[PDB]
Amino acid sequence: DDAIVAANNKFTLEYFKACYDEKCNCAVSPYHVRLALSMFYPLAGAAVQEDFQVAFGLPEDVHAAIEQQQRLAQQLHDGQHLKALSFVLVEETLRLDSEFERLFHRTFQTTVEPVDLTDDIPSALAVNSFYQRANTEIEDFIGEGDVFSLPPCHKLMLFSGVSVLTPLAIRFNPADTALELFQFINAPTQRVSTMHTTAFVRRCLHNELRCKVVDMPFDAASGLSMLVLLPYDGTELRQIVNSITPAHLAQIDERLQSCWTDLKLPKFFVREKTDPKQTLGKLGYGGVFEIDDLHVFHDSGRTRLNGFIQHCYLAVSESGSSEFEFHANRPFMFLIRRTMDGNVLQVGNFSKYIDPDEQ
């Protein structure tokens, strides 16, 4: 388990560096990218099995890899606190192979829906309705364009939703929320609802990374916490995002100390659709999308994965229950971690002003 977490954190930060765009807000879960894609490892030929061994550290013992995926996925998905749900579309006119059925219908925690993948309307509706019924705060998971193809149409597509739903354990008082400037990259003087409290939070300075750090816990029952990295003045968020490694996370864990902190944070959310197929390609792991290597169907030949879309959600809000200042009034990075082992479950940034009356 120590090795799995170490490897996941290293991959998570590399993946985030490959998708971060300083002009946009982002939330991704590389861990769930790994868990969802790993379901195809037992079905994969030599080229893709090698890719997944390199990218994710999967066991060469495929039986052990299946058991590992099951254990890790069950630990991650946690009811009311964090929902991590995969969904698979398969072309309905192709009979499935018996091992795919065994694994995807009767082994892995996932849902497979056969659809007419030549028709983007029912294909998108199957995905969107699944995530709506899952009550995971993502009501428009994909658009029709995300599943569309001209002939020869797609045969196989994968989806990951990761939603952090647990409330913060820090008591922000809404009487103290006010419109305050936030230095958005696209609107440096825009004012937005900004929460304020005095909290006894774990905090540190990190002079090498050039940021202040607070670890903001969620409700105790979730076992989760949000590390917020706020660049020092005169330092761009991109420098923190590109610099950070697991070694820095370890140093932060050693340096954090609980301290009465004057905390200011926008009342924010991030709900962002991303494309693991593109990001994994950038990291050198495009093989599963570029080589026809997965044994899914009975009599149509091995297939590539035609698409993999992820949609993540996180929001913060006030609670119904000083020797450091942490005023997050400029772009920051966040990491959602399991407190017990430090495993990073979701990572992102808040940088851009999105007017809710406009979009």
User: Who contacts 348 (Cβ-Cβ below 8 Å, separation ≥6)?
Assistant: 16, 25, 26, 27, 28, 270, 272, 312, 314, 333, 334
Residues 266, 328 contacting (CB under 8 angstroms) = yes
* Residue 111 belongs to a domain: yes
Resolution in A: 1.5
State the Cα–Cα distance between residues 351 and 347, nearest whole angstrom: 13
DSSP classification of residue 43: G
Number of domains in the chain: 2
Cα three-residue angle 109-39-339, rounded to 5 degrees: 65
Show the domain range for 155. 1-167+266-318
The DSSP bridge partners found for residue 168 are 218
* CATH number of the structural domain spanning residue 191: 2.30.39.10
Q: How many residues does the chain have?
A: 359
Residues 35, 76 contacting (CB under 8 angstroms) = yes
Residues 117 and 136 in one domain: yes
Residues 326, 266 contacting (CB under 8 angstroms) = no
* Residue 355 belongs to a domain: no
Residues 68 and 111 in one domain: yes
Look-up of token digits 């894609």: 37
* Residue 62 belongs to a domain: yes
Residues 327 and 312 in one domain: no
Q: Tell me how the structure was determined.
A: X-ray
Residues 308, 158 contacting (CB under 8 angstroms) = yes
* CATH number of the structural domain spanning residue 292: 3.30.497.10
State the Cα–Cα distance between residues 239 and 295, nearest whole angstrom: 42
Q: What is the DSSP string of 259-324?
A: EEEEEEEE--EEEEEE-HHHHHHHTT--HHHHS--B--BSSS--B---EEEEEEEEE--------E
Write the burial class of residue 340 (CB in 10 Å: 0-12 exposed, 13-18 middle, 19+ buried): exposed
Tell which residue, 97, 42, 30, 96, has the closest CA to residue 70.
42
Secondary structure element (H or E) that encloses residue 229, with its range: strand 224-231
Residues 258 and 273 in one domain: no
Residues 202 and 163 in one domain: no
Tell which residue, 275, 131, 269, has the closest CA to residue 193.
269
Residues 237 and 327 in one domain: yes
How many angstroms from the chain centroid is the CA of residue 345?
A: 6
State the Cα–Cα distance between residues 88 and 161, nearest whole angstrom: 12
State the Cα–Cα distance between residues 358 and 187, nearest whole angstrom: 14
State the Cα–Cα distance between residues 194 and 329, nearest whole angstrom: 9
Secondary structure element (H or E) that encloses residue 237, with its range: helix 237-243
Look-up of token digits 């390609």: 281
Start-end of H helices in 20-141:
30-38, 46-56, 62-76, 98-106, 120-133
